[PDB]
């Protein structure tokens, strides 16, 4: 009900002020209430959170200018602390391995530069928008990798394979 | 340093309840 | 003249019991000892030590000069040299008490019950007609004072003293979180009178904010202060409301709070929700604070550059 | 229990691996029994004479 509006607007982003203005604001009000909730209320919520937070996230996977993914990351770092299995894991996949796609579509960039001088500020930029994303998910997904990690172990598990085959 | 201020004892004058205490203490 | 320095001293002597070759010394070494025979010894150990300086006085005038390590007051004296200077003050004590003499005159209260926090609150008191004074005159002196030497002392001294001075003292929790309340009131809407010269007012307020020794005794007690709380966080909650008419419209004395109260609203929140203090932290005084201020978020929950520390005070919040 | 999760990927052989008797334990008896004073004793000293 309340948190059923954000998924609404999770798709069509491409901006951190146009269209989700009040989002930037109201997304740790509900990321620092939710974790501190006649009680128990159901994880479900949590992680539908998680997952359009991420989607948020990799919405704007190439915005020039954005400061907003180096505090969402770091507000919604408790929030995946109690997370599903599956239903994270669903969506850690895509998103890691459209931004290995993006690195492997901008390393050709500085292979092939090997016009110097322009080349070179071009590439530093990518590589730094690069490093942005890189830090803005990297965080959510060194926590969902602590845990998880032993059932990923005792059980062998495809994706889990993959993952590690996409970070390497 | 230390310059001393010596509180006033010559002035007053012993009772009669107090020898006997300075002669016992003075054997002991 | 040991004696007659105590009858001088204003001391009552009343006899309360009856006074009980090789001789034979009776054993004096069953006797214990009180806290307040302690002073009555040591200022009575001070006349033997006393009387030999007045002689050794003119004995240095007669040599003309010199500095002697026994010539010292006898505050400096340790246990190692009292061995040599006790001892003839110790032997008359259970003499006393053996003869049957009498003499009349918590040690929390004795001690410093009161403690650093409370002078440093004394010296905040004061600081109070200091700062009345300075208004006054803005609308000489203490004024450098609070900005050089009081000021990073606390901000310090709450800082080296955040733990063990809030879980165990109980009376100096009751006053650190007024002591804020002050400190908050001190700074006017406006931070111009205190200037660029000191800045680290703000830093000072995050650090007692962060320092809050009676989170839930404030609540618990009987509410002499709370009214003070009470109305800090209604003064707060006024001013960020007042933000409307200014952000939400089109500036003066109203963008020097965003930047000295916002944060350290924000440190409070994290304060409270730090150590889930949510079991007593909304009672007498405290309830018709967070009914207006629950009022005041969803009006100011739709409002350029203030978007991060509003996010950031409601997450803490 | 917990050696597959951490300890077996990195390398660590348990402590028994190819013995097919388990490991000798000793322990502290707190029984005084009566040993020669030790010629570097930091207190007591015995000279014979």
Request: glycine share 4%.
């Amino acid at each position: 009900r309340l948190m059923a509006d954000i998924g609404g607007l999770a798709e069509s982003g491409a901006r951190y002020t146009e269209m989700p203005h009040v989002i930037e604001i109201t997304l740790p009000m509900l990321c620092s209430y939710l974790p501190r909730w006649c009680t128990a209320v159901t994880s479900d919520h949590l992680n539908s959170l998680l997952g359009n937070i991420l989607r948020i996230i990799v919405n704007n996977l190439g915005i020039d200018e954005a400061t907003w993914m180096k505090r969402l990351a770091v507000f919604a770092q408790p929030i995946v602390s109690r997370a599903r299995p599956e239903l994270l894991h669903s969506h850690f996949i895509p998103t890691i391995g459209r931004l290995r796609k993006r690195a492997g579509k901008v390393v050709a960039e500085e292979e092939q530069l090997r016009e110097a001088e322009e080349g070179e500020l071009l590439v530093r930029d990518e590589f730094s928008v690069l490093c942005r994303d890189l830090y803005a998910l990297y965080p959510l997904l060194i926590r969902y990798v602590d845990n998880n990690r032993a059932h990923w172990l005792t059980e062998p598990n495809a994706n889990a394979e993959e993952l590690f085959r996409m970070v390497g | 340093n230390f310059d001393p201020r010596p509180v006033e004892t010559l002035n007053v004058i012993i009772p009669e309840k107090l020898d006997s205490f300075i002669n016992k203490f003075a054997e002991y | 003249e040991s004696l007659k320095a105590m009858i001088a001293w204003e001391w009552t002597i009343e006899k309360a019991r009856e006074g009980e070759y090789n001789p034979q010394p009776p054993d004096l070494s069953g006797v214990t000892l009180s806290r307040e025979l302690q002073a009555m010894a040591e200022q009575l150990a001070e006349n033997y030590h006393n009387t030999w300086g007045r002689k050794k006085k003119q004995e240095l005038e007669a040599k003309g000069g010199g500095t002697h390590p026994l010539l010292v007051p006898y505050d400096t004296l340790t246990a190692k040299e009292k061995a040599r200077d006790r001892e003839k003050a110790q032997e008359l004590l259970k003499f006393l008490q053996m003869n049957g003499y009498a003499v009349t005159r918590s040690s929390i209260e004795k001690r410093f019950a009161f403690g650093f926090l409370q002078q440093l609150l004394r010296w905040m008191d004061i600081s109070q007609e200091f700062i009345a004074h300075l208004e006054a005159v803005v609308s000489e002196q203490e004024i450098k004072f609070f900005a050089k030497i009081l000021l990073p002392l606390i901000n310090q001294y709450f800082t080296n003293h955040c733990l063990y001075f809030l879980s165990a003292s109980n009376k100096e929790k009751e006053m650190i979180t007024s002591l804020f309340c002050k400190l908050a009131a001190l700074v006017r809407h406006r931070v111009s009178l205190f200037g660029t010269d000191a800045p680290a007012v703000v830093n000072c307020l995050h650090i007692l904010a962060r320092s809050l020794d009676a989170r839930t005794v404030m609540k618990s007690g009987p509410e002499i202060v709370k009214a003070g709380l009470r109305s800090f966080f209604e003064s707060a909650s006024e001013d960020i409301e007042k933000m409307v008419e200014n952000l939400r419209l089109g500036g003066q004395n109203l963008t020097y709070t965003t930047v000295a109260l916002l944060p350290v609203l924000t440190t409070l929140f994290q304060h409270i929700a730090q150590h889930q203090f949510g079991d007593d932290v909304i009672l007498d005084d405290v309830q018709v604070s967070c009914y207006r201020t629950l009022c005041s978020i969803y009006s100011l929950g739709t409002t350029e550059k203030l978007r991060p520390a509003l996010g950031e005070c409601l997450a803490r919040l | 229990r917990f050696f597959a999760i951490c300890g077996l990927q990195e390398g660590f052989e348990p402590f028994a691996i190819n013995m097919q008797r388990p490991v000798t334990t000793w322990f502290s008896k707190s029984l005084p029994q009566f040993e020669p004073v030790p010629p570097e004793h930091p207190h007591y000293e015995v000279a014979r004479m």
